[PDB]
Design a protein around this motif. Structure first.
Motif, PDB file in Angstrom:
ATOM      1  N   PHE A 249       0.811  -1.213   0.000  1.00 35.62           N
ATOM      2  CA  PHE A 249       0.000   0.000   0.000  1.00 35.62           C
ATOM      3  C   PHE A 249       0.852   1.274   0.000  1.00 35.62           C
ATOM      4  O   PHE A 249       0.437   2.308  -0.532  1.00 35.62           O
ATOM      5  N   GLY A 250       2.038   1.184   0.602  1.00 27.93           N
ATOM      6  CA  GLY A 250       2.987   2.306   0.698  1.00 27.93           C
ATOM      7  C   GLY A 250       3.253   3.092  -0.575  1.00 27.93           C
ATOM      8  O   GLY A 250       3.035   4.299  -0.599  1.00 27.93           O
ATOM      9  N   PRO A 251       3.742   2.424  -1.638  1.00 29.03           N
ATOM     10  CA  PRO A 251       3.913   3.087  -2.933  1.00 29.03           C
ATOM     11  C   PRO A 251       2.599   3.533  -3.600  1.00 29.03           C
ATOM     12  O   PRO A 251       2.563   4.604  -4.212  1.00 29.03           O
ATOM     13  N   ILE A 252       1.547   2.717  -3.481  1.00 32.80           N
ATOM     14  CA  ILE A 252       0.193   3.078  -3.941  1.00 32.80           C
ATOM     15  C   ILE A 252      -0.265   4.436  -3.372  1.00 32.80           C
ATOM     16  O   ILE A 252      -0.813   5.275  -4.094  1.00 32.80           O
ATOM     17  N   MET A 344      -0.295  10.270   8.714  1.00 30.20           N
ATOM     18  CA  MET A 344       0.158   8.927   8.351  1.00 30.20           C
ATOM     19  C   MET A 344       0.181   7.979   9.535  1.00 30.20           C
ATOM     20  O   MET A 344      -0.071   6.782   9.377  1.00 30.20           O
ATOM     21  N   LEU A 345       0.489   8.519  10.715  1.00 29.53           N
ATOM     22  CA  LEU A 345       0.408   7.766  11.975  1.00 29.53           C
ATOM     23  C   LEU A 345      -1.023   7.304  12.235  1.00 29.53           C
ATOM     24  O   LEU A 345      -1.242   6.129  12.537  1.00 29.53           O
ATOM     25  N   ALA A 346      -1.988   8.220  12.096  1.00 30.97           N
ATOM     26  CA  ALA A 346      -3.417   7.884  12.188  1.00 30.97           C
ATOM     27  C   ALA A 346      -3.822   6.808  11.178  1.00 30.97           C
ATOM     28  O   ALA A 346      -4.446   5.811  11.539  1.00 30.97           O
ATOM     29  N   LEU A 347      -3.451   6.996   9.917  1.00 33.78           N
ATOM     30  CA  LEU A 347      -3.818   6.035   8.892  1.00 33.78           C
ATOM     31  C   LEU A 347      -3.277   4.646   9.229  1.00 33.78           C
ATOM     32  O   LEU A 347      -3.986   3.649   9.090  1.00 33.78           O
ATOM     33  N   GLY A 348      -2.036   4.599   9.703  1.00 35.33           N
ATOM     34  CA  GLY A 348      -1.407   3.342  10.104  1.00 35.33           C
ATOM     35  C   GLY A 348      -2.021   2.710  11.347  1.00 35.33           C
ATOM     36  O   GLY A 348      -2.192   1.483  11.402  1.00 35.33           O
ATOM     37  N   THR A 349      -2.329   3.552  12.346  1.00 30.49           N
ATOM     38  CA  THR A 349      -3.058   3.136  13.538  1.00 30.49           C
ATOM     39  C   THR A 349      -4.332   2.468  13.085  1.00 30.49           C
ATOM     40  O   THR A 349      -4.554   1.292  13.360  1.00 30.49           O
ATOM     41  N   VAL A 350      -5.157   3.226  12.370  1.00 29.89           N
ATOM     42  CA  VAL A 350      -6.453   2.755  11.917  1.00 29.89           C
ATOM     43  C   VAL A 350      -6.374   1.441  11.134  1.00 29.89           C
ATOM     44  O   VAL A 350      -7.180   0.543  11.356  1.00 29.89           O
ATOM     45  N   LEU A 351      -5.400   1.315  10.240  1.00 31.39           N
ATOM     46  CA  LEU A 351      -5.271   0.092   9.454  1.00 31.39           C
ATOM     47  C   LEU A 351      -4.784  -1.085  10.302  1.00 31.39           C
ATOM     48  O   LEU A 351      -5.252  -2.203  10.131  1.00 31.39           O
ATOM     49  N   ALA A 380       3.891   2.308  10.405  1.00 28.23           N
ATOM     50  CA  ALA A 380       4.130   1.412   9.296  1.00 28.23           C
ATOM     51  C   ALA A 380       3.935   2.107   7.955  1.00 28.23           C
ATOM     52  O   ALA A 380       4.586   1.750   6.965  1.00 28.23           O
ATOM     53  N   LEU A 381       3.045   3.094   7.913  1.00 29.16           N
ATOM     54  CA  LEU A 381       2.883   3.887   6.696  1.00 29.16           C
ATOM     55  C   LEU A 381       4.080   4.822   6.517  1.00 29.16           C
ATOM     56  O   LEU A 381       4.496   5.074   5.398  1.00 29.16           O
ATOM     57  N   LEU A 382       4.634   5.314   7.626  1.00 28.64           N
ATOM     58  CA  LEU A 382       5.886   6.068   7.614  1.00 28.64           C
ATOM     59  C   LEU A 382       7.069   5.234   7.128  1.00 28.64           C
ATOM     60  O   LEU A 382       8.091   5.778   6.712  1.00 28.64           O
ATOM     61  N   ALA A 383       6.950   3.916   7.215  1.00 28.83           N
ATOM     62  CA  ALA A 383       8.021   3.040   6.775  1.00 28.83           C
ATOM     63  C   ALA A 383       7.927   2.774   5.283  1.00 28.83           C
ATOM     64  O   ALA A 383       8.940   2.681   4.612  1.00 28.83           O
ATOM     65  N   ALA A 384       6.719   2.647   4.755  1.00 31.39           N
ATOM     66  CA  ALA A 384       6.557   2.274   3.354  1.00 31.39           C
ATOM     67  C   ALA A 384       6.309   3.475   2.438  1.00 31.39           C
ATOM     68  O   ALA A 384       6.108   3.317   1.233  1.00 31.39           O
ATOM     69  N   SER A 385       6.338   4.674   3.006  1.00 31.39           N
ATOM     70  CA  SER A 385       6.117   5.888   2.227  1.00 31.39           C
ATOM     71  C   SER A 385       7.233   6.892   2.433  1.00 31.39           C
ATOM     72  O   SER A 385       7.793   7.385   1.467  1.00 31.39           O
ATOM     73  N   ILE A 386       7.566   7.190   3.681  1.00 32.71           N
ATOM     74  CA  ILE A 386       8.740   8.001   3.963  1.00 32.71           C
ATOM     75  C   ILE A 386      10.010   7.152   3.848  1.00 32.71           C
ATOM     76  O   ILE A 386      11.106   7.673   3.648  1.00 32.71           O
ATOM     77  N   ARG A 387       9.843   5.836   3.938  1.00 29.59           N
ATOM     78  CA  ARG A 387      10.953   4.880   3.955  1.00 29.59           C
ATOM     79  C   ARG A 387      11.972   5.208   5.034  1.00 29.59           C
ATOM     80  O   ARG A 387      13.173   5.057   4.828  1.00 29.59           O
TER      81      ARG A 387
END
Ligand code: BR
Ligand code: BR
Ligand code: BR
Ligand code: BR
Lengths: 444, 221, 211, 440, 221, 211
Positions: A249-252, A344-351, A380-387
């Motif tokens: 989902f990160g690159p998406i 992005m923290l919220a989005l990752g929390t929620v997912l 986790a979204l910070l990992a796959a998007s901010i890398r």
């Protein structure tokens, strides 16, 4: 190469006293700066809360005074950007990053007031943006300001005080000292060659800032999650799975943020009027949505505890996710001053919570608590998007304080960073400077 | 670390009860708690569990609302409610603290138990009879005496010779239920020199019927 | 719903023997645990996750196996090693225990010390007559008790109950009680209690005459 | 001219490297675990062997000494005979290996360090398992490079780093500290590198799992949740930091100077060495009875000190004694790190500072235990000069995140004054001394 | 979050008593706990503090064991035991949970107090008498009722009306000491069209003698 | 041990006034806190660290000061602030409190409501006799109750008692109790209780007669 290193291993960790003192002042300023910014955003959000009470009977006039109120503030911010400092839209971290590559100027005389008051407007209206953007860039600039005001020669001084500014900036944004420091060394360092960034200085900066933040906004945490349960070894594979999901989902997401900047450019053409108006339209939508559904709008630091505890139904989660993907894009991709970190923290929390939900009913054997899957998925979204996994992972760990989950977090993180790569994705803060630089030259 | 369940006993079929389990020696929050019962003879069977934040309560493929597991972390105590009781529910009931190793969960520390008899039979006390031997048989080297605890309900009774001091070489036989009353007998083998010269007594307690009785074994004159 | 079954239902072995039970599951099991239960005390955790001794468990015990069959094992078995061992999985949900295996201290044979008692002067007052007969202390546990009322066989009104294996000397005891009405009893003279063990080719007769 | 190369291909590690990382960590994991069980086993033997002579007191003090003595000698020999470059910590050796100024003779070092330290640690010497696991780890990383023939500076430097990482991780159950060690300190910080951080993670993860498959459910340091740190209290941590900052280089001198003074004793002679080794190793197992607090890893007195169970007296004593026994064990080339004994030194000194502070400032409502934990990684800051690594190491082991500000302060305060009083990263001063005898 | 002190009351000079406040609603460990005094109508005076692990216990300038402050985290209870009690100890004892802002500690949350009276007079339960209008009520808008509490020993009592459902309109007057016995009255005012129509009850409670009287205002017939 | 001494010991003021009380310290203290003690309640953390408000304290309040002088200021006091306030320091062990400033409310005139009550049935049954008079909700606080048994004045055996000021209406209430023996109270018929107050030129009287 040989005698070079020999003895010159002394003069490792030897930062010039002048730089170290200057870091102290840089942090102290970025601190107070961040604090003041933060109080401001609070005050303004509160005014709109008080103003919604002068109209709490007439429901359709409420929906109006919410919208228009956030609209006026958004427009003011969008303007203060487009007019006096264009380079202070978006997060502004890729701008600070370029400044370390000496590919972008640090126009502090401009950005400081522009970003401060600018974001103070977008955030104030309750837009879906984080205070990082502002404080990291404001921080970075504050670092350059003191460089100039004191005229400090050397690549060391320039890069160091710029880094430590950006650091103390991220720190004060989350009350996350280590996260700040780690942000620089893991990510923010010019990772194409070595640097003269003195890490001992970054420290002093971060320390000072973090104290300044704690002198004021203290005794209360940004995220309280309580001490969640543990994670049995036979459970770890479920985190690698969640990681993979974040990894695909990160690159998406990185596409959409990028592509959406494009699609939104058309709407205004670059026209400072259609823009500022389009701005106040989104900013208005936010203050409106921040009433009819508060979980779809704002920073996201509110639904985090509520989601981790599993107080949301699986339905309300899926909804909050979709809605927040939408509102996050609309606010960030459209140049509004304000970071994308917190959203992005919220989005990752929620997912993560959603994954936890499912995992809980598929594996009663494991005795799961969805709340741990939320916390693992938070950075986790910070990992796959901010890398920048190590940064996000320590960011989460500093905010949520459930160290027993370090193994699961590291796994979801790495699992995300790995699949983000292999599915063909790229550090979002890099793909953005790659563009602003490419557009700059392609304009010659 | 002690678990202490209580609250079992005699219940009529179709009735209800509230087994309690009180924790100590550890932070009773933090832990998943569980109820497991053992039907006499039979074997071990798991009723259910409940986590610290009561957000999950699982029961066995027991049918619709038979049990109600709840916990009050404030008193550090675990509750089980069994309603619509049956013969089937007649068992020894254990609370257990749940833990794991590799994460395949196990039953960490158990409590002593509480017994729940479900039957229509009325609580009756025991009638207690000495079993001196007749001068027909040999006075011998080792003399065997005895006690008949006849027709009481329900379990248990407790038999202990000479305020339990004479504990050396006692036997107590598992009580037998016939026609809604229980019967059991206690043995005691003592040296020919010790009885009748010295007094052997038989101490019986069936507290279900507030009975405490002591029957002196005297020789058959 | 997963079902575990333990190979020896009951079994016996002499102090210093190689005791080896079993736990076999209808479907796939992982990391099973073992509980030891002594009579009148709460079960205790013994082995876990297929084979890990608990904090106090002496080093002679050991688990092993996988997939569908696991095993508790004792090198140099002891006296205090006698109890019921319940295996238990949670590899699947819901969790499930096994039947149990009772391990018992096999000793040298013993002949039952038979003892016979006439009804009390108290039981009779109130019209009851129970003639009690104690077959104490014997190995193995198999025994047949039979009553004779005036030399005649009686099978109605007998109630037997063996104790579980003695802790002191790993014997067995046995209790036959014959219950008659005060009249039914008073209409006869010689009451005999005849115990048949493996220890003798001839039953141990013990009796009394009311005369 | 090509003013681009741009940004995409940041965080783009070759799939081959990433898989190899996984295997490296897994090996370093088990390796670390096995090593760890061994040291335990052997300490236990000497514990049991002290029982067969628990009545005759002077024969006990003998069976302790000789017991540790024999094991010490075994280790010192296994080094001097088969791999001299596996004495001391071995971190400077792994660091040099990243600068391509030292070779990774794995075929030698692995068995030498493993069994070597397994002897020094076993005898209850004042050395940490890091030395062994970090180096062992690093080599294990090179072994798999060779055995699979991997071209490129990237692969070489990466798998070597992730090995040393997974190695430090498994030594403390400290995944973050492992990763941070590389990025903060262990990276060749004179220029950029091709060390793939994504790989280091994978390595550290696998290793940490391996460690937790076996030695888990129990922590190395249990301290409980200490109290908080009021803002008006922070200055006391800057003071403590300064103290560690002035002492940091002074200790760095002694470790160095002591290597020298101890060299004379044997001249370089593998017999006088191995004998002098077993003399100290013997002293350790002896001291590890008559006073256990002056000998061994130090992970024991940490909880006992943090709780403030030691008197002010017993602390100063433990400190002096441990300064002595630490130098004798490390400076004398014995295989085994100096990290762990530095954590204990820092704990002990912090507690002492806490003690004082507590009775000078009843207003502040202090608990010495907090100054212990701040001080724990403070010697690691003023001597290794790797504060971020030590601060996360302590935080991962002691779990009192509320003390992060005070820890960061003591840390910085130490790193600062270590610089200004003229000191230098000890693991750099040692590689510098070794490369200055190779060229001079 | 509540603090409930208790076990105050009457002590003879030179005697000793164990005050004990029960805490709940917050993690009782992690909290320094304190004790403050208030002599009748005087100012607050700090007695002592104690840390969570009972390892640091400071008192005010006092003697040997004048005060001895304990703490049982198993029971969330704080203890203070004053010995050799002179009359200056006659005061209201507050237990306070301690905390800080920037670091200078303040008394975070206070209990309700317990009164300790250093005297000889025997503990005496009150006599509660109802005061109703004089058989000829002017039948105005409101009617004023009261009940009089006479001759009891230590302070306090706590009068309330209709178990607190009668909140507004109440006035409890401060007690007055006369020949070593306290005496007070409480005053309630209710709509006249509401009494005797509905029942008005006077709930007097004297904690020291554990007596609690519930008098009903009987309209002088 | 720093000795703190507070501005006025007691101070009147009328809702609307800006009110200031000061806290003075012998030695030099920093970051003092204030406690509000409403009548018959326990102290409540009001202001802390010199000028921060405890959550729930209205914005009308503020703290300040520095060396040996500190102040609590109510900007436009309200009647519901009637309380004794205490300053306290803990910047030098042992911490120490001030003596308190009792803030009194000034407020428009309110006339007392007098209520007379005969000795009760239950009371006479036990031998005593108290007649009780209730002067309720008056202001100012100075009142003169006066007892007239059968026209003549009584002063022997009378006891008085005043409430604190109220926190809503800021009024006072009083009670006067005449205490007599049974025989005594019976050798008279008509009882009166005379209340004198600035609100009436002529005293307020309530009275009951046994006939
Ligand atoms: Br941006
Ligand atoms: Br951002
Ligand atoms: Br070394
Ligand atoms: Br080391």
């Amino acid at each position: 190469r040989r005698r070079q290193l020999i003895r010159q291993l002394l003069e490792r960790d030897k930062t010039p006293l002048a730089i170290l003192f200057m870091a102290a002042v840089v942090g102290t300023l970025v601190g107070l700066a961040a604090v003041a910014f933060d109080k401001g955003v609070a005050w303004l959000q509160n005014q709109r809360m008080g103003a919604l009470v002068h109209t709490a009977d007439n429901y359709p006039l409420l929906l109006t005074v919410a919208f228009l109120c956030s609209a006026v503030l958004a427009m003011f911010g969008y303007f203060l950007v487009r007019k006096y400092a264009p380079e202070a839209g978006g997060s502004g971290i890729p701008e600070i990053e370029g400044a370390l590559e000496d590919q972008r100027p640090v126009r502090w005389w401009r950005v400081l007031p522009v970003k401060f008051f600018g974001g103070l407007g977008t955030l104030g209206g309750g837009m879906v943006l984080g205070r990082e953007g502002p404080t990291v860039q404001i921080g970075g600039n504050i670092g350059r300001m003191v460089l100039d005001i004191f005229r400090l020669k050397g690549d060391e001084a320039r890069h160091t005080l710029l880094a430590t500014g950006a650091a103390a900036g991220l720190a004060a944004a989350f009350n996350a000292p280590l996260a700040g420091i780690l942000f620089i060394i893991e990510h923010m360092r010019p990772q194409f060659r070595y640097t003269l960034i003195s890490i001992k200085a970054v420290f002093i900066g971060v320390i000072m800032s973090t104290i300044m933040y704690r002198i004021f906004n203290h005794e209360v945490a940004l995220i309280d999650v309580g001490k969640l349960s543990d994670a049995p070894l036979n459970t770890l594979w479920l985190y690698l799975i969640l990681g993979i999901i974040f990894g695909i989902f990160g690159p998406i997401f990185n596409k959409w943020v990028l592509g959406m900047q494009d699609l939104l450019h058309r709407v205004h053409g670059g026209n400072i009027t259609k823009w500022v108006l389009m701005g106040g339209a989104i900013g208005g939508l936010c203050g409106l949505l921040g009433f009819v559904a508060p979980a779809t709008s704002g920073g996201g630091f509110n639904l985090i505890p509520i989601a981790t505890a599993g107080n949301f139904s699986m339905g309300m989660l899926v909804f909050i996710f979709v809605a927040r993907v939408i509102t996050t894009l609309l606010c960030f991709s459209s140049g509004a001053p304000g970071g994308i970190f917190a959203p992005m923290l919220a989005l990752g929390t929620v997912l993560g919570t959603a994954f936890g939900m499912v995992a809980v009913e598929l594996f009663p054997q494991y005795h799961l608590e969805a709340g741990t899957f939320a916390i693992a998925g938070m950075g986790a979204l910070l990992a796959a998007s901010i890398r920048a996994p190590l940064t996000g992972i320590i960011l989460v760990l500093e905010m949520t304080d459930n160290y027993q989950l370090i193994l699961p977090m590291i796994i979801t993180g790495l699992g995300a960073t790995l699949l983000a790569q292999f599915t063909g994705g790229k550090p979002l803060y890099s793909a953005i400077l790659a563009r602003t630089l490419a557009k700059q030259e392609a304009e010659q | 670390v002690r678990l202490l369940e209580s609250g079992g006993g005699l219940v009529q079929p179709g009735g209800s009860l509230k087994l309690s389990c009180a924790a100590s020696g550890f932070d009773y929050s933090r832990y998943w708690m569980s109820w497991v019962r053992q039907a006499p003879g039979k074997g071990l069977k798991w009723i259910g569990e409940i986590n610290p934040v009561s957000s999950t309560i699982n029961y066995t493929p027991s049918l619709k609302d038979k049990f109600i597991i709840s916990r009050d972390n404030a008193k550090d105590t675990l509750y089980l409610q069994i309603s619509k009781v049956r013969s089937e529910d007649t068992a020894l009931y254990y609370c257990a603290r749940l833990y794991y190793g590799y994460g395949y969960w196990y039953f960490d520390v158990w409590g002593a138990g509480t017994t729940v008899t479900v039957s229509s039979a009325k609580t009756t006390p025991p009638s207690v009879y000495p079993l001196a031997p007749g001068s027909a048989a040999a006075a011998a080297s080792m003399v065997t005496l005895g006690c008949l605890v006849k027709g009481y309900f329900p379990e248990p009774v407790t038999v202990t010779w000479n305020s339990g001091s004479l504990a050396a070489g006692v036997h107590t036989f598992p009580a037998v239920l016939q026609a809604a009353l229980y019967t059991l007998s206690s043995s005691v083998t003592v040296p020919s020199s010790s009885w009748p010269s010295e007094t052997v007594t038989c101490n019986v307690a069936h507290p279900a019927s507030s009975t405490k009785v002591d029957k002196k074994i005297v020789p058959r004159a | 719903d997963i079902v575990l079954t333990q190979s020896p239902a009951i079994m016996s072995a002499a102090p210093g023997d190689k005791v080896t039970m079993t736990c076999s599951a209808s479907s796939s099991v992982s990391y099973i645990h073992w509980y030891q239960q002594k009579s009148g005390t709460s079960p205790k955790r013994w082995i876990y996750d297929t084979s890990k001794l608990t904090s106090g468990v002496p080093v002679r015990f050991s688990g092993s196996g996988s997939g569908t069959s696991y095993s508790l094992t004792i090198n140099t078995m002891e006296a205090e090693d006698a109890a019921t061992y319940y295996c238990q999985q949670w590899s699947s949900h819901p969790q499930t225990f096994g039947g149990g295996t009772k391990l018992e201290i096999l000793r040298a044979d013993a002949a039952p010390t038979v003892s016979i008692f006439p009804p009390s002067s108290e039981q009779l007052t109130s019209g009851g007559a129970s003639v009690v007969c104690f077959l104490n202390n014997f190995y193995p546990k198999d025994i047949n008790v039979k009553w004779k009322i005036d030399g005649s066989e009686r099978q109605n009104g007998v109630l037997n109950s063996w104790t579980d294996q003695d802790s002191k000397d790993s014997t067995y005891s046995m209790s036959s009680t014959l219950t008659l009405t005060k009249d039914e009893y008073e209409r006869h003279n010689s009451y005999t209690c005849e115990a048949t063990h493996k220890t003798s080719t001839s039953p141990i007769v013990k009796s009394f005459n009311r005369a």
